[PDB]
Amino acid sequence: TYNLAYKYNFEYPVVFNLVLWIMIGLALTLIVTCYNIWNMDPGYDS
Amino acid sequence: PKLAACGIVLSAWGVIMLIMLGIFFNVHSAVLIEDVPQNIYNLYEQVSYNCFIAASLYLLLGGFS
Amino acid sequence: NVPVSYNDSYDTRILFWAQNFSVAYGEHWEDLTSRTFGVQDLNLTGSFWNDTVARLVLTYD
Amino acid sequence: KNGPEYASFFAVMGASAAMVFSALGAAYGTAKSGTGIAAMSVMRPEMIMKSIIPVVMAGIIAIYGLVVAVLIANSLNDGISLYRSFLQLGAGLSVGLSGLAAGFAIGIVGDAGVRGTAQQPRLFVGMILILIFAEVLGLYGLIVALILSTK
Amino acid sequence: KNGPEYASFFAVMGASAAMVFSALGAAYGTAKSGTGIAAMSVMRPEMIMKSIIPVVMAGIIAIYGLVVAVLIANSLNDGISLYRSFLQLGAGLSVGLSGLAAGFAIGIVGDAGVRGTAQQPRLFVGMILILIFAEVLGLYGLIVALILSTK
Amino acid sequence: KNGPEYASFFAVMGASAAMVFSALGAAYGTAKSGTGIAAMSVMRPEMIMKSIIPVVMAGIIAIYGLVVAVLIANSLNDGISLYRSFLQLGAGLSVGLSGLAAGFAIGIVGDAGVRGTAQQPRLFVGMILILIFAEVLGLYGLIVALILSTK
Amino acid sequence: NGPEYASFFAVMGASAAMVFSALGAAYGTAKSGTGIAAMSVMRPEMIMKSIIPVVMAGIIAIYGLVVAVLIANSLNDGISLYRSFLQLGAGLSVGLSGLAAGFAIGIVGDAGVRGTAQQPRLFVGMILILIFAEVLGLYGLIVALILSTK
Amino acid sequence: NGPEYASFFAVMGASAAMVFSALGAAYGTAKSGTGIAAMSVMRPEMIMKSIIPVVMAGIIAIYGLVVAVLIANSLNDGISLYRSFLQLGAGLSVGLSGLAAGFAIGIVGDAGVRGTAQQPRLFVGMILILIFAEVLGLYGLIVALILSTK
Amino acid sequence: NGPEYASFFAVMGASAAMVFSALGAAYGTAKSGTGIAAMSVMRPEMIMKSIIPVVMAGIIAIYGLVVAVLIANSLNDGISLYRSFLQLGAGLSVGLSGLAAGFAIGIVGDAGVRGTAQQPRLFVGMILILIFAEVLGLYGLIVALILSTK
Amino acid sequence: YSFHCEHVSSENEDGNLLVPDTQPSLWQMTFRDFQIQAFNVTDKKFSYASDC
Amino acid sequence: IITFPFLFAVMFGDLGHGILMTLFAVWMVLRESRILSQKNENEMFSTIFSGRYIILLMGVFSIYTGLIYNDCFSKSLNIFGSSWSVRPMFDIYNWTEETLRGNPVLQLNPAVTGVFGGPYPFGIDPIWNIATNKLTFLNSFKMKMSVILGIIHMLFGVSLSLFNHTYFKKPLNIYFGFIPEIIFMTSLFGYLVILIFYKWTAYNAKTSEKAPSLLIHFINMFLFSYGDSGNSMLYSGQKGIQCFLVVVALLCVPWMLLFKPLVFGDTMVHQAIHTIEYCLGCISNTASYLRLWALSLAHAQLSEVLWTMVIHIGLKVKSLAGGLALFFIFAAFATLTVAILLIMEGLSAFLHALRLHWVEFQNKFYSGTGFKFLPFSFEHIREG
Amino acid sequence: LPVVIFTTFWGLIGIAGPWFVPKGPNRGVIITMLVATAVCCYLFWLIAILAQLNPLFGPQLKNETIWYVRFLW
């Protein structure tokens, strides 16, 4: 009577794809933003 | 010149700081119980024996400098 | 509390657990998880086993 | 009544991204225009206190994100509904990424607007009028975060 | 009749993406064509207030996304159907990414137009004629976002 | 008769892509071939209004996508079959990616055309005859989207 | 209480409040530290008045170390999934908004100390821009406080 | 006791405490080691005094050694999932904050010894900015000892 | 014993200790060895004096070989998952820290031998920097011996 | 392996696993948890679960 | 002269470094005769010697605030105290020898009789330094005291702006520049420092485990949403008085704006900047005083890591600890506590006690366009 | 109670402080130095003895430090 399954919720493909395609949509938006401020090129001789 | 000059102010601090560490371990202070691996008081004085022979060892560096 | 467990030999066979077995005829909802996995005395009339076909019959009266 | 246990994840990501993406816009408006102060001030020292208007107008962008990052963080309860937490997610992106654009525009037109005032002082009343249009992009995104999050 | 729990995600995304991508287009129109005002200012400073036309054209792009971020966020209920929220996802994308394109076209023509007006004053009637064509790209996305949000 | 609850995702994604991808092609042909107006305006200012055809012909690209995206948004219905909604995703890709690429060729030929007409005015009937062939490409995507959406 | 993997998102808020904040404090020190080395060959008297963008950028690491202590002291066994997501958003909003304030100090403090060598009037104006560039790291702190008390 | 895979996150914090801190200690030694060669052809007397910015980067490596020894001595088969998540965040916050601290040392130590060749007065000012970029690795030490020993 | 897939993570610690310390030793002998060729045209005397960055880059390769033999001799059919996680992190700790140390040797050893072509006073200073880039592989060794021999 | 799912209810909304043969069905049932195994039950307990 | 070494001492407070900071400074003032005989040295002895009296007052003040919270090289002292007593915990709570296993970290109980009596005559009791929940007490104390020092130093700065008007005889400037400024600060922020003082005296450990939070009730003043059973009210009639204290501050924005320009286009727009740099600036100035809590925490945490990792390995050795081990441990410890814990922490606390005067104190009264006197004299020609 | 003791022992300086001051040219500075030292240092003590008065927590002690100060206090 032992060895019951781990109880994944029924909406597991929804919550997996809501987290995955946001946290790599907010990481690519973060990486592209911090890439442009790192390489700013203000112009500095004077 | 400066390595001879920096050594005396470190030794003058080395005798002041480590003597007071010797007296604070002789009185068996309750704040310093992390450094101890009536019987426990004897370990405290042992560290005070340890500190003092290094506090006196900084006097030799003062005379050498 | 424990799952339903049918056996024909000394070895055990098909076994089935649920947390809320509930049925409805028309619009009357009747919960049956208190008569199934706790009562320990089920009417498993023909619970077949053949290693390629198995049936689990639960009857409630 | 009470939502699921994962439901407050999306409302927290609307609270952080309303401050992360709006500080990343206000950092571009401060850095790109503030380097324009360092090049202008070598030849015209009298205009170092009138040219800090593009760095105070990019500082309102981070205030636009801080207000709704607090306002989202007060509507956070244990077990909020999944509908109520997507509103905080949709309010955080619509003010962070909107203030990221508003801080990128203020940095560009604030940089050129103070490179040009060192050669033409009549530009300075026109530089404010473009810095007003580039600032209300953070204000337009604010009043969508005020409408979305308060439902 | 009632929609699922995750159904409100796609409509609060179209509320944000109508404001995020239209402010990202209005900021490109303000930055790229605000760089050109500082280039025409150093030689022809009478045409400063008359050259704010390419940045008031990009300001209408920002309020195209503000209207349908209010039209979507006021049409939100808990448990809206999955069809009724998919309508307001494409109503947010077809006006954000249309105003994003129409802001790339305003900022490029507004940059070359006000730098060519400094050397040829007969271009100002032509630049303001191209900016009508580049502003109705955000308007064609507005009248397809209103026809999607209302149903 | 009633399809799945996510069936209307693919039709609105075709109504969005019919307007988004056409506005990107209409903004390329306006910004690229409107940059070419300001280069020929400085020396040959009498050919300004005659050379607004490559931003007019790039504006008909956007009204090809507006006609399809209105027909998809009017043929939308709660509980559409999964067959009928993919017919309007293929109708959105047929006029979306057509107007994206046909609006690219109006930009490149229109920018190269108005600079080669201002020096050799015999090329004006030769520029408009290449732009016609790049504008019927946007109409091949239109009249195959009218077949698919009304199928 | 909560599940066993609930304490992962809270220690990713204690780490990312120190990783992403010491990365912003490193960029404000490195990009402006080359501003001191290029300036001082011309004007070697301002190497004590002009290290103030380095000292200002040494607070972005301290703003993240403070949040990484409130999170790592509120960690106990069996925190809920709700209370652990609050400490993840308190660690990103003070780390990635300290990465923003470390950019705007490192770019302004670089060019600001070149322009102070050629003209000493900029010192009142350069220190004023570093006020507006440091409060981006402070606004992320007071939204990390309002999340971590819940 | 905990699950079978629970020791994966604690050893990954024992490796990343040494991997990412040696990657910062190498960039502080390699980037400021090319600055010794460009300094050498002008001022040969400043050789032994310019080994200080690679000494400071050498302490970044032992900041990650005293956390990787600390994790790899407290390892046991069957540690809980909570206790091993604490040592994953103890190695990520002392490695990636020593990678940032070693980045800023290699940049102000490279440019600092370029300006020391043209002017010897910068050497007391270069050694000040090397301290402020050193404590970014020390701030990651004091948040690693909080997370690991608790 | 343990599961059937358990020996995968120990083999990927035996091979990552080798192929990442051989990539560090590749960059050590190739980037410094291309500086010996540019030094040789004007100073052909100190050719044998300049194999020291190439020798100390080969020490990094035998640091990874010792751990990879030590891991591959501690393998059994059916080890625990805890033991094979220990040797994965013992392979990354000497592989990816030897890749950092071998990158640092190849950079300062390249600029060092091009600096001793124009001034031989750098030679006693070039070797003293390379010991600091040598011990980053040695620190990765003594954490790999601690992790694997548990 | 065994099966496990969280909703094996009837009354088809999007993806409910128990579908009736004719749609005006009088019977409806609902499992808020579910775990069944056949043909390899060993030692009177479930195996690893092939989840739904 | 007082408040700048005092604000340096709240964020750099240590009795051990309070000894070293003044002993470096007493050496620079008692031996200053032979130092003026020398021409010049490096700027680590030229700029430091020019401020030899500033560092002297930073030493004697940080001995005091390095005694309030005990913190002497992160070690603490007993002067007639330790009011937390562990022995009643073993007796009345029926709390036997189980300490060994079970729970290895055990927390005391203040509500049971005998454990806490008297709040330790002078300062912070040293039971916290040997506790492991030390930081969750200090962060409730050092943060709330960073606003108490942040309001009464900024209310003192606006009280010096009244005499900038009544001496120059500009009584118009009082009724829009001092009276609505002191109403806007006392109703919002001067109520906050008496809301912090209220929670210290009202709630004890016996009653009110459901204690209110001061973060929420301050935000719920601005956001008018009142009524929720999560956070109980601090006192009776809180919805009555706090709605009054916010609406008296709301009318101060028209009181500063609409009633000054009646004397026009540039005194309405450019002098609205004088209101909005005070309107949203006063909130961002109060929160800017949290940097004397962050620096006080980062200095107190750096003092542990040089003791419990450098000194402790030289101390916790069984047989040969104080011999050849501790001679080289302390000589490397004395270099690490000077170069890190006294130079950069003494310079990080130096600037952020200085920028709190330039921006958060000299913006309320100090305008400062200025022109220096520079009298013609021969004091340039001293010896060279 | 030291609260009624230290209110006048830090109240001597600042009230009897300006009463006994020499008539030199440093009167306006030394009185400012004596009064502000009495205001800052006493209020620093005042907001520290009020934090521990009516507390809410207890010192979480290590296990070796459960039985140790029973012999020491």
Ligand SMILES: CO/C1=C/C(C)=C\[C@@H](C)[C@@H](O)[C@H](C)C/C(C)=C/C=C/[C@H](OC)[C@@H]([C@@H](C)[C@@H](O)[C@H](C)[C@@]2(O)C[C@@H](O)[C@H](C)[C@@H](C(C)C)O2)OC1=O
């Ligand atoms: C203060 O008003 C402003 C308002 C803002 C922020 C937003 C909306 C109103 C706008 O987003 C809406 C959408 C568009 C619209 C209608 C704006 C009017 C703008 C102002 O007015 C043009 C100009 C103003 C500079 C402009 O007015 C010039 C003074 C000018 O008068 C000079 C003329 O030579 C110029 C040709 C003429 C044209 C541009 C309208 O206006 O700025 C402004 O900040």
Ligand SMILES: CO/C1=C\C(C)=C/[C@@H](C)[C@@H](O)[C@H](C)C/C(C)=C\C=C\[C@H](OC)[C@@H]([C@@H](C)[C@@H](O)[C@H](C)[C@@]2(O)C[C@@H](O)[C@H](C)[C@@H](C(C)C)O2)OC1=O
């Ligand atoms: C004012 O904006 C105009 C139209 C706008 C706002 C709105 C949408 C419907 C439009 O968005 C879409 C693009 C309409 C469309 C697809 C063409 C309409 C074209 C007009 O009809 C030629 C020209 C054109 C008449 C005119 O602009 C030029 C004066 C000119 O006529 C001068 C001629 O000498 C030149 C030869 C001629 C070309 C067209 C033959 O261009 O403009 C406009 O009125």
Ligand SMILES: CO/C1=C\C(C)=C\[C@@H](C)[C@@H](O)[C@H](C)C/C(C)=C/C=C\[C@H](OC)[C@@H]([C@@H](C)[C@@H](O)[C@H](C)[C@@]2(O)C[C@@H](O)[C@H](C)[C@@H](C(C)C)O2)OC1=O
């Ligand atoms: C190469 O062998 C040396 C160290 C090695 C190999 C260290 C590692 C293996 C690792 O085990 C150690 C732990 C890395 C480490 C923590 C070194 C600390 C200090 C030493 O002490 C300054 C210098 C020092 C004795 C000396 O090399 C420098 C030449 C010098 O110190 C002396 C002077 O020229 C110069 C004036 C001084 C400056 C900057 C004041 O730098 O390490 C050595 O020598």
Ligand SMILES: CO/C1=C\C(C)=C\[C@@H](C)[C@@H](O)[C@H](C)C/C(C)=C/C=C\[C@H](OC)[C@@H]([C@@H](C)[C@@H](O)[C@H](C)[C@@]2(O)C[C@@H](O)[C@H](C)[C@@H](C(C)C)O2)OC1=O
């Ligand atoms: C067999 O391959 C050689 C070494 C190999 C492959 C070693 C591996 C087993 C490796 O695992 C390591 C690197 C073992 C090791 C550490 C050898 C060190 C030096 C070698 O010596 C023993 C040099 C050395 C004799 C010689 O090559 C140089 C000419 C020189 O003798 C001349 C001196 O001017 C020079 C300064 C001195 C320095 C470079 C050591 O070495 O050679 C070799 O042949």
Ligand SMILES: CCCCCCCC/C=C\CCCCCCCC(=O)O
């Ligand atoms: C769930 C949301 C995740 C997806 C959101 C993506 C939206 C992206 C928004 C902005 C990214 C653009 C930032 C790059 C700035 C460009 C700089 C430049 O071109 O000068």
Ligand SMILES: *[C@@H]1O[C@H](CO)[C@@H](O)[C@H](O)[C@H]1NC(C)=O
């Ligand atoms: C199940 O096994 C037990 C134990 O051998 C046996 O007594 C019982 O009769 C079996 N069940 C059936 C229905 O035969």
Ligand SMILES: *[C@@H]1O[C@H](CO)[C@@H](O)[C@H](O)[C@H]1NC(C)=O
């Ligand atoms: C689920 O089970 C609980 C008790 O186990 C019961 O009270 C409840 O009625 C069940 N759900 C339904 C829908 O019957």
Ligand SMILES: *[C@@H]1O[C@H](CO)[C@@H](O)[C@H](O)[C@H]1NC(C)=O
């Ligand atoms: C098992 O039983 C089923 C149903 O009675 C039957 O169809 C099948 O042939 C049987 N198989 C064997 C191997 O007896």
